[PDB]
């Protein structure tokens, strides 16, 4: 019989380009076939999915699609089966520990990830602003830009305000710019200053207009979508809205530049550290089967396919250079560096009530309920229940 396969791939992540892959795996592979079972679009949905799945020891999925920041939960709890023994050597440094965790290896790199400043390059040019390298001249530039097209669509900034996992990276943009650590020596390590004035920073886009009013509502894909629309100046987003921008849908073609975020006045432009790896459900029924897809999929030849066909940044550093990727998406070329000092959210099996505590702060304060000073407060309170002090 065949062997029916189901991996766990969210509906954010593509999953038209990796049916491709895998229809390739099943046409070199007799008696395997794969399916794929459809996520939701955020980090912490899919989650409260597996959460819900794996805590029933359901047996129905074999391969799972998880969060750079999964491997200490599931590693901690048994859920998946471990590679320990294997050489992570070809891959990134970055994500080769990643996946360790006590010395044992969660999971295999699925693809790399950063944040970026994406820009409309043409109203940038026609006002002759370059990239703004602080947040303070992002805010000059988008009021610039605002004031000359008189458009009332024209959103100067999007970012994710919605309570979801990219809103724990939103507040700590800010944080770590200015030099400040979640955790320090595995110690939380709270700055309560620079805690607020993150919180102030993004209230302070929808108070003076930059942002739209409802930010709190957004979404990593909301983001990708108006961008994509043309509703946008400047967009905190990951590498794969570039295969959006640049696709069949889209009315910002040619049009979009790269640029490393802005830094907070005196600090340094830093980034979120994301990606995702593939792991063996330790409950799946077909472990060998399971295994051998996973192997493939993390496979270099695979890292090509979706850096060139969905944007997704490579897990070998060879593939940056690689002449048909750098080609397709020349900027690709210039992303290693930001990857590789790209700042990682806590390591912890706790990781989703830090998730939950940081995201929904983030979302209160932008929704109007909480002021920044309180919520800051509430942050470092409840973090100090779950984090080691
Ligand atoms: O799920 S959220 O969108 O809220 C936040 C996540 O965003 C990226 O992943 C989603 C992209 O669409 C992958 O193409 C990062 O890679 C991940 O680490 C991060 O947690």
Redesign the pocket.
């Known amino acids: 019989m065949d062997a029916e396969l189901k991996i766990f791939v969210?509906s954010?992540?593509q999953p038209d380009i990796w049916r491709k892959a895998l229809d390739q795996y099943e046409a070199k592979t007799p008696g395997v076939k794969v399916v794929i079972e459809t996520g939701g679009?955020?980090?912490?949905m899919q989650a409260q999915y597996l959460n819900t799945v794996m805590s029933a020891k359901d047996s129905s999925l074999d391969v799972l699609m998880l969060?750079?920041?999964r491997p200490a939960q599931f590693a901690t709890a048994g859920w998946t089966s471990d590679f320990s023994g294997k050489d992570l050597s070809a891959y990134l440094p970055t994500y080769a520990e990643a996946n360790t965790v006590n010395g044992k290896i969660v999971a295999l790199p699925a693809f790399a990830?950063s944040m970026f400043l994406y820009y409309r390059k043409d109203l940038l040019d026609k006002y002759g602003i370059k990239p703004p390298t602080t947040w303070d001249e992002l805010k000059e530039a988008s009021k610039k830009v605002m004031e000359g097209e008189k458009n009332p669509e024209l959103q100067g900034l999007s970012f994710?305000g919605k309570a979801?996992?990219?809103a724990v990276?939103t507040f700590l943009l800010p944080y770590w710019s200015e030099g400040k650590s979640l955790v320090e020596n595995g110690k939380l390590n709270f700055d309560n200053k620079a805690a607020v004035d993150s919180l102030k920073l993004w209230k302070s886009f929808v108070d003076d207009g930059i942002s739209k009013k409802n930010i709190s509502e957004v979404?990593?894909?909301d983001t990708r979508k108006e961008f994509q629309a043309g509703k946008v100046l400047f967009a905190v987003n990951?590498?794969?809205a570039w295969t959006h921008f640049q696709g069949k849908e889209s009315q910002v073609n040619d049009k979009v530049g790269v640029a490393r975020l802005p830094a907070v006045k005196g600090g340094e432009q830093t980034t979120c550290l994301?990606?995702?790896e593939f792991g063996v459900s330790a409950y799946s029924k077909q472990q060998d089967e399971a295994k051998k897809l996973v192997e493939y999929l993390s496979s270099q030849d695979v890292s090509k396919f979706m850096a060139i066909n969905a944007a997704?940044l490579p897990t070998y550093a060879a593939l940056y250079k690689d002449a048909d990727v750098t080609k397709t998406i020349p900027w690709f070329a210039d992303a290693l560096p930001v990857v590789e000092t790209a700042k990682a959210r806590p390591v912890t099996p706790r990781y989703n009530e830090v998730s939950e505590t940081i995201r929904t702060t983030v979302n209160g304060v932008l929704a109007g309920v909480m002021t920044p000073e309180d919520g800051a407060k509430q942050m470092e309170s409840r973090l100090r229940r779950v984090l080691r002090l």
């Open positions: 969210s954010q992540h679009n955020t980090s912490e969060d750079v920041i990830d994710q979801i996992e990219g990276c979404a990593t894909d990951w590498s794969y994301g990606g995702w997704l």
